[PDB]
């Protein structure tokens, strides 16, 4: 049936895309529409699975979605495209000359895309391996945890803010203690616990936005003060 529409073409490009969409196409296009896409070497997935070796993200612009943040840990990310690509392409199909260069997402340049080829993840490069995360983090620990792990964090210890003691805090096995927190009340509690029990050791306490901006640049800038609530080094 899609063959019929595609019969009239002398030859079909193979775009070799393995993608997810975020901020666009939030389930699909019709069955023929997707059938055409597969015939053109474009496969669109529902969720991100590490062993699908995704290489593409469609999105209208840089977004703070779980999917977008996770696309920055594809191995590698090859294409970050506007949905206008799938749209102009399907429009043409209903020779094929839609190209993979006229649909770049603003702000996602080559320098950034190419960091996804590095043999390390952004936080691994930064020696942030184990962190503590407050349970009242917006987005929830499960999701935020999943983004952080995709980006090189090996252990996520969730801390019940109000009730937690020093023993609950895990070290980062360089900052000995790394915590991601929501409010100032939390900074004071944690700095007090650690300084009482492990006075001479180093501590980094940041906001969620510190991680987001690290991911968007695929680099932890330790000289930056923005989103850093407390540091003892």
């Amino acid at each position: 049936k899609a063959e019929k529409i595609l019969a009239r073409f002398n030859e079909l490009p193979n775009y070799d895309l393995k993608a997810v969409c975020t901020g666009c196409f939030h389930d699909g296009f019709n069955e023929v529409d997707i059938e055409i896409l597969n015939q053109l070497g474009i496969k669109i997935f529902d969720n991100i699975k590490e062993t699908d070796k995704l290489n593409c993200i469609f999105a209208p612009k840089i977004l703070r979605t779980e999917k977008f943040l996770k696309s920055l840990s594809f191995e590698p990310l090859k294409f970050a495209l506007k949905p206008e690509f799938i749209i102009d392409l399907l429009k043409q199909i209903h020779q094929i000359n839609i190209n993979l260069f006229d649909y770049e997402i603003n702000g996602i340049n080559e320098s950034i895309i190419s960091k996804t080829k590095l043999p390390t993840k952004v936080f691994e490069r930064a020696n942030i391996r184990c962190i503590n995360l407050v349970n009242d983090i917006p987005g929830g620990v499960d999701t935020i945890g999943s983004v952080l792990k995709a980006h090189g964090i090996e252990k996520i210890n969730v801390l019940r803010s109000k009730k937690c003691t020093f023993e609950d805090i895990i070290p980062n096995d360089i900052f000995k203690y790394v915590l991601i927190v929501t409010k100032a009340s939390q900074v004071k509690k944690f700095t007090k616990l650690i300084n009482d029990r492990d006075k001479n050791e180093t501590i980094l306490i940041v906001e969620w936005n510190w991680c987001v901006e690290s991911i968007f640049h695929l680099n932890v800038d330790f000289t930056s003060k923005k989103n850093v609530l407390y540091q003892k080094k």
Partner: peptide, 5 residues
């Protein structure tokens, strides 16, 4: 819809 963080 997708949660923006």
């Amino acid at each position: 819809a997708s949660q923006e963080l």
